[PDB]
Amino acid sequence: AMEIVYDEADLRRYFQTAVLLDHFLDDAVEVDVDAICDGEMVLIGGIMEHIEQAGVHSGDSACSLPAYTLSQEIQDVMRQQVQKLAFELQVRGLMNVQFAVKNNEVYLIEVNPRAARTVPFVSKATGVPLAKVAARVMAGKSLAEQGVTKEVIPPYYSVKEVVLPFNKFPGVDPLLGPEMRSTGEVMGVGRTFAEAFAKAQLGSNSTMKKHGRALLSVREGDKERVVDLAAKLLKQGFELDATHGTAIVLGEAGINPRLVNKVHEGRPHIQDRIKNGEYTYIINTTSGRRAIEDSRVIRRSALQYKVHYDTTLNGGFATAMALNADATEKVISVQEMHAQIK
Amino acid sequence: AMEIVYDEADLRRYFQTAVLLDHFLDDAVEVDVDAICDGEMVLIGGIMEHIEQAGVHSGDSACSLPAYTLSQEIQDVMRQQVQKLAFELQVRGLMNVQFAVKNNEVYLIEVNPRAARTVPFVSKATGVPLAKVAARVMAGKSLAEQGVTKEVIPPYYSVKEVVLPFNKFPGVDPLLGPEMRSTGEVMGVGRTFAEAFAKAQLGSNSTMKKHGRALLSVREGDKERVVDLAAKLLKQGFELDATHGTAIVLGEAGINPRLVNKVHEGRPHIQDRIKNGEYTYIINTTSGRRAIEDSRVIRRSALQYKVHYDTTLNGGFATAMALNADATEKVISVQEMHAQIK
Ligand SMILES: Nc1ncnc2c1ncn2[C@@H]1O[C@H](COP(=O)(O)OP(=O)(O)O)[C@@H](O)[C@H]1O
Ligand SMILES: Nc1ncnc2c1ncn2[C@@H]1O[C@H](COP(=O)(O)OP(=O)(O)O)[C@@H](O)[C@H]1O
Ligand SMILES: NCCC[C@H](N)C(=O)O
Ligand SMILES: NCCC[C@H](N)C(=O)O
Ligand SMILES: [Cl-]
Ligand SMILES: [Cl-]
Ligand SMILES: [Cl-]
Ligand SMILES: [Cl-]
Ligand SMILES: [K+]
Ligand SMILES: [K+]
Ligand SMILES: [K+]
Ligand SMILES: [K+]
Ligand SMILES: [Mn+2]
Numbered sequence A, B: 001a002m003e004i005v006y007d008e009a010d011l012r013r014y015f016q017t018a019v020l021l022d023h024f025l026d027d028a029v030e031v032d033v034d035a036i037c038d039g040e041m042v043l044i045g046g047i048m049e050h051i052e053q054a055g056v057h058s059g060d061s062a063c064s065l066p067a068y069t070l071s072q073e074i075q076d077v078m079r080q081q082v083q084k085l086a087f088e089l090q091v092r093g094l095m096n097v098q099f100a101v102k103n104n105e106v107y108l109i110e111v112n113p114r115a116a117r118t119v120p121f122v123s124k125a126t127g128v129p130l131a132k133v134a135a136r137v138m139a140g141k142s143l144a145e146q147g148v149t150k151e152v153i154p155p156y157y158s159v160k161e162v163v164l165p166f167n168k169f170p171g172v173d174p175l176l177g178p179e180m181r182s183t184g185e186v187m188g189v190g191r192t193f194a195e196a197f198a199k200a201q202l203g204s205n206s207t208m209k210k211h212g213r214a215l216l217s218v219r220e221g222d223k224e225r226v227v228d229l230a231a232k233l234l235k236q237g238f239e240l241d242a243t244h245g246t247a248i249v250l251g252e253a254g255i256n257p258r259l260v261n262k263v264h265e266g267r268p269h270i271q272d273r274i275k276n277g278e279y280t281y282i283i284n285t286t287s288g289r290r291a292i293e294d295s296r297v298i299r300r301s302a303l304q305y306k307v308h309y310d311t312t313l314n315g316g317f318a319t320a321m322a323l324n325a326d327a328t329e330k331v332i333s334v335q336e337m338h339a340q341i342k
């Protein structure tokens, strides 16, 4: 059971309720790299950029292969580090490495010296059966002997999205965090990231629509980038609702959402509006135990009412991009996918 | 000393800091009627309909001759009532009667069996020198004998607005009530109530602009009608800002102002805005000893920064109507005015 303490008081408050301590890498991109070491060389299976930032468990994060925003440059630094780690720790077969990118800096989060859960997706995505390869390495056949020595970068994007069991446990706050709660995953294949993401999103049973009213209620950190999300939604045809401070931020930028009351503020409030079906999209971000506790009503309603919702700004942007794609437009077989690989 | 108490709490509260008790006619139109009685008959000098509701002292209320909203049927009752009083009281000379109209019902405020401060305005409006006649009547010369027996109804609108000394006493809260504080008055003459109001407004040294951003912050009782007012403002090309509760009501009507913070909510706040000359108009209504003391900065700032502001919704509608008029478009002389009277 992890925790992200924000302040001193927070700390106590934690222990009370409650040991390692790690500085939390706020606003960093999380990445996973799957690889194979045969003692002689390292084979990079895949570099997957997560959509949800570090702090949202990698198992609960949607992710993309190839990276959708990371510079090749910083990806090179990761590949090198993966390499140094592989040789140093004497890996023989699969490994997984998790990093956090912040301010153009690579930070190591952990090393899993075995097959990680990302293995099948990377394999489907790249056409290389890494578990068969790594198993051959284990039994003694080298990467070189098997002919699997060069990293494969596919010509299309593969996006992985997860499914959470929150609807099975209503009393739980359907919020993402450092601890993994998802039961499964799906894969979206597209020409662009928007396209992959849209397939991934639909595949994951998302109720997201291409029109309607969107409710925006974001935390302080999010106040800046929210403006841009709000316009993208505007550009797409949605109308907007916003709670107090979010409305303020949007107002100051020129966006004037319809103001909506928090449960405490009066009626009608969000709960009522959600209950009524006024929304087709909800973007709600939060930060701080207490802040989280209050906003619980939103997610709870959103889930109960089947309204698609994002709890991270990164996810919101990803959702916004997919609005530009059409998941039903084109289909492709795995055989065809793999045949496109040069 | 008069004040309106709203609840049990409030009443002691008063008595504390502090005798007749009278029920307060809320959301009522105040009316003034000047009249002459000689024992034989009653001449109606004029029926004036206040812009500001009962609760804002007549003396500080803007007014209209002829009535701009009241039905003929209701004036008829007041006319009826006045006569009854005159004879009843044995009025010989001038008299004044104040009424309040609630739900199509006429309530009697007071009777002043003497010359009222409205006499000169009525005289000027109607061409009938009420003071001369009444004196004559007082000395023994009947209306009949004077040949002043019919109620004159002007072909033009006559609006009286007042001037308040707030600017000379900064420490004071520039807000209207049951006690009179104005020192003078002005008159506006027009083809329409709007044109008349517009002249009276300009006459009163108002800083009202025909463009800019308006700030709307209104009470509960007003939250409903404010929509129409907001619409007018928008139709006129103003941009709107609203405090929370007001913003909620508008938005719920399709009207999304720019949300703004009270002083206690954040920076920038209203005071700041005002201070920055961000507004050209402010509509601020309040109810309650506290809601009032809490809004004080709005009015003080507004007065101090020379921004035109109205403290009644009625006053705000009038201001709006006047936006459709040109005070400097047409001029007329008292002589012509009177010449127009048949
Ligand atoms: N220092 C950190 N800064 C930001 N996020 C972190 C940090 N440490 C861990 N996390 C978050 O916690 C998650 C799980 O931590 P990790 O060490 O990988 O635990 P696990 O063994 O459960 O897989 C990560 O996937 C990440 O999103
Ligand atoms: N019962 C009432 N309901 C509403 N407003 C009232 C009532 N009584 C007085 N007022 C308001 O207070 C003002 C002053 O009361 P009034 O008896 O006329 O006082 P004054 O002697 O100063 O002229 C009125 O002009 C009116 O707007
Ligand atoms: N990849 C996690 C699922 C995202 C979920 N809609 C949310 O953002 O909370
Ligand atoms: N006739 C009263 C003065 C009007 C002023 N703008 C107010 O509404 O406070
Ligand atoms: Cl794993
Ligand atoms: Cl449950
Ligand atoms: Cl008087
Ligand atoms: Cl003073
Ligand atoms: K993550
Ligand atoms: K692990
Ligand atoms: K009045
Ligand atoms: K009096
Ligand atoms: Mn991990």
Ligand SMILES: [Mn+2]
Residues within 6 Å of the ligand: B058, B098, B110
């Ligand atoms: Mn009076």
